[PDB]
Design an enzyme around this catalytic site. Sequence first.
Site, mmCIF file in Angstrom:
data_model
loop_
_atom_site.group_PDB
_atom_site.id
_atom_site.type_symbol
_atom_site.label_atom_id
_atom_site.label_comp_id
_atom_site.label_asym_id
_atom_site.label_seq_id
_atom_site.Cartn_x
_atom_site.Cartn_y
_atom_site.Cartn_z
ATOM 1 N N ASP A 35 0.837 -1.200 0.000
ATOM 2 C CA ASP A 35 0.000 0.000 0.000
ATOM 3 C C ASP A 35 0.872 1.251 0.000
ATOM 4 O O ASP A 35 1.335 1.686 1.051
ATOM 5 C CB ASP A 35 -0.900 -0.029 1.227
ATOM 6 C CG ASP A 35 -1.819 1.161 1.297
ATOM 7 O OD1 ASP A 35 -1.901 1.892 0.285
ATOM 8 O OD2 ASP A 35 -2.460 1.366 2.364
ATOM 9 N N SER A 199 -0.584 15.479 -12.163
ATOM 10 C CA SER A 199 -0.810 15.113 -13.551
ATOM 11 C C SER A 199 -1.047 16.372 -14.380
ATOM 12 O O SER A 199 -1.580 17.372 -13.896
ATOM 13 C CB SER A 199 -2.017 14.170 -13.637
ATOM 14 O OG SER A 199 -2.385 13.894 -14.973
#
Length: 330
Positions: A35, A199
Amino acid sequence: STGSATTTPIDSLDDAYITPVQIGTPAQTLNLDFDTGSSDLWVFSSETTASEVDGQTIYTPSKSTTAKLLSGATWSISYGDGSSSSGDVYTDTVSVGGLTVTGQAVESAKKVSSSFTEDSTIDGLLGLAFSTLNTVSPTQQKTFFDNAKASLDSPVFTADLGYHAPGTYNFGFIDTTAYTGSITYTAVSTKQGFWEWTSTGYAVGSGTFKSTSIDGIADTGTTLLYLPATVVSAYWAQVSGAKSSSSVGGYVFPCSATLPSFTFGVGSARIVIPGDYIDFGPISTGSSSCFGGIQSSAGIGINIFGDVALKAAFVVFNGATTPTLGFASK
């Protein structure tokens, strides 16, 4: 040193991935959910409330000659999906894919919430976010990667998740046969303890690319792709009959649909998520309403590049003094 371990989807939907981890002496192998959105290595154990164990493999510290109680240390964690676990702490030897750390904090669960009990395939979590998020008190502990870093050939790990197939976590090296083209690296903020990056935009299907900054986290422990409501609406508007359902908890679409791809930007590069990766199947057994793999992050407070996005790429988690993320097509 290096390590290399195969990671395997837990079910036919890729709801999560499990990777075998050796703990203790002699080794006890548990299948952990790696994770990159959390920083605790915790396991089902001989100390877990018996009624909360249902098929998991447990770590038994009393059977490990290298286990030592970390006296006074406790831990307690709550995840974004509302699940939680807590307990006490041992140090022990932990190996992943041939890479060994001695003295790793192994957080032994005394209590786990129902969603953990109900998932017999996940024996615990191995956190790979920054150690500043580790919950052990009163002495915060380091992640497996943080402990291994100095010994690694290069201070990196890579995630290569498969679509409906096994993939690989590598530690200490970049497998140049595992991706196509070049790796595009992008800046990371560690201020919130995550692999947080920006992004450069998105496209839906064959549509034109929209240049827009989307801050979010690379999180192998989250199944889906969670993005701003504007972006998610633009995606689902291209699917006839798709709608946001308050009763189901997100966007659903007709199971008869063919889904468009979704592209996200990494600098000037582009990662394409095929439409099939966005199909999470019937909302309930036999339903013709299917659950979408791109969902709104509104109310979560952060955008999450979960498995849906990451499995479309070869992803480098670069833990150099100034961390960065790398993405390549594959």
